[PDB]
Design a protein around this ligand. Structure first.
Ligand SMILES: *Cc1c(COP(=O)(O)O)cnc(C)c1O
Ligand SMILES: *Cc1c(COP(=O)(O)O)cnc(C)c1O
Lengths: 350, 350
């Protein structure tokens, strides 16, 4: 039923019989067809949500991690390393535990909320805090990949991009062709770069007639790609895309230019609106960063920038359960009422 | 495109052409073959984990809710209601949202933490806390469904049980035959009941060669089915199975006797151990209650009560992201080290 990602696309991936398949049955996620919004429905525009939140660790990063770790193990690596918290750390820790190797996470001795590393820790991640800054931490991470058999699994790891482009493969397999547009969040730009690589690869194989316009969106307070310059003070509630200087900058610009798409911004308020829309009207619960993709579609529709009768696919990068802080900001218990049927039906709106 | 759960097994479910399919592409969850544990390899036993945590809302509840809501709407219902929290409320809210109807959750004021219903609220759940106790909320919840166009989607909703039968169908479709043993958590016992009914249903069709032995497990502090009598004040860190009087008592007992299986208890300590094992060894992150199933396998293994060379399927009911409280609880961050390559490599264990 649910096969290993690398197995499903073995012929299209940099693997061989010598590649130890370290999988958690990631990928092959649901492509939920959305009912609306009505602004899209009235123009005959159909939306589909690639629910990447339904991956083993909760984010699409499992796609690149499964391959990155598999190749790392093939290369004889005793452990994978990254200089980040959140999903990347959680995914790396999970696959390292599956592979039976160590997962190293180097971070500055500063303040770190256990929420950002709790998941990676339960998996057995080796978190090391150093008396330095983000620069020193990422520096020590590299040197650790030069003096010891450690594989750096950060955003620039080629294998991560190779594995993440499979999402595009799955979309085409389901729809029968590439969509007209494809919206997704943009943090370090590795995912958008991979997406484009995927669609171009499927077109070169003859499995896709068209190439979609990549619609990447960033949070207003953290849109270095929109401003065309690094943002030394990234600000946004969408933690996953709180990036001031994307590692895959060049890749993002290329995908934007070649696909004839755009990389624009949406405010946190817009992100929160899309966040609620997906949950309350589509039944889809994703984290804010992911909602940004839907916020992007709302923006273009509002501007009438999406051709009618077109198909729009959105990559909801992470599951809502990933960020309880935002859920609690939106959630609220109503004032209690008397234990009477009349009062209940009233407060219920019946 | 991919056919929804209730359509995949339409011939085995009480649905028809007039049944409005309210789906979020739930089901078809991964069946991850576990590496161990060692105690299992020792006897040549094979364990497979049915990752129900990868369902739309994060729990297997979606299997029953997709059918419950679909039927409710077919019946003309304008909303569904329950007196639950956690996973049931979140699931009911998600599908209600998908269906475009209301999801009412009646709770006793002051008894429920915001976190326990945050997910449902994000989906637009209409929470109504009454000035009384669970008995009052439970009482007027059914009264609400009697006086108004609201379908009751509580534990005993026959459709929720029928929909949960599909999990067994999927296990057989992939393995080719039913496993020798099938362990899972036991709260209201509606799931273990559904599992059994699903297995003997596929067996009556010829799709399943044999019938598995249902191995149900409860937390020691909340094991009414193990003690053979209700538990006034059930207690355990596994909130999902913290039930003192299972609504499906009878169904669970029958499934136990008919399958020649068991319904035993495991301590919270044992649950946490399995919890850590799955994540630290298999790379699978599930919530405490789900880990109870694995803790049970460990138990029967120590007691040498599992036939060697046998296949064991574990239903991991919910995803670990469902309980950030526990994950951060067992979490631990070691003291910082100097920003020297020799310091990091050492702390990491290189
Ligand atoms: C990593 C991540 C992103 C950002 O993707 P980039 O490839 O870094 O652009 C967005 N959302 C979630 C949930 C993520 O885990
Ligand atoms: C609902 C639930 C259970 C209990 O299942 P029952 O059918 O009540 O026995 C166990 N674990 C999780 C994660 C659940 O959501």
């Amino acid at each position: 039923m649910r096969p290993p990602l690398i197995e499903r696309y073995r012929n299209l991936l940099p693997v061989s019989e010598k590649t130890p398949v370290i999988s958690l049955l990631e990928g092959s996620t649901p492509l939920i067809p959305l009912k609306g919004p009505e602004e899209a429905r009235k123009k005959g525009i159909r939306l589909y949500a690639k629910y990447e939140g339904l991956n083993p660790t909760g984010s699409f990063k499992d796609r690149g991690m499964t391959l990155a770790v598999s190749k790392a193990v093939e290369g004889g690596a005793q452990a994978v390393a990254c200089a980040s918290t959140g999903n990347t750390a959680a995914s790396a820790a999970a696959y390292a535990a599956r592979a039976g190797i160590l997962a190293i996470v180097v971070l500055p001795a500063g303040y770190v909320a256990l929420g950002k590393v709790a998941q990676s820790l339960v998996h057995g991640a080796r978190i090391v805090q150093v008396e330095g800054n983000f620069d020193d931490a990422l520096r020590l991470t590299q040197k650790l990949t030069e003096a010891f058999p450690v594989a750096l699994v950060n955003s620039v790891n080629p294998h991560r991009l190779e594995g993440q482009k499979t999402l595009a493969f799955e979309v085409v397999d389901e729809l029968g062709d590439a969509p007209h547009y494809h919206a997704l969040p943009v943090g370090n730009a590795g995912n958008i770069t991979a997406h484009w690589m995927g669609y171009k690869a499927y077109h070169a194989l003859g499995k896709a007639k068209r190439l979609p316009r990549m619609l990447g969106f960033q949070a207003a307070g953290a849109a270095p790609l929109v401003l065309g310059r690094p943002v030394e003070r990234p600000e946004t509630l969408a933690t996953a895309i709180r990036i001031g200087n994307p590692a895959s900058w060049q890749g993002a610009v290329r995908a934007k230019e070649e696909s004839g798409g755009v990389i624009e911004a949406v405010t946190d308020e817009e992100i929160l609106f899309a966040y609620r829309y997906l949950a309350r009207e589509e039944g889809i619960f994703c984290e804010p960063a992911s909602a940004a993709a839907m916020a992007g579609v709302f923006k273009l529709l509002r501007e009438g920038r999406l051709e009618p009768e077109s198909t729009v696919v959105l990559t909801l990068t992470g599951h809502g359960l990933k960020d309880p802080a935002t859920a609690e900001r939106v959630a609220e218990l109503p004032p209690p009422v008397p234990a009477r049927l009349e009062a209940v039906a009233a407060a219920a709106g019946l």
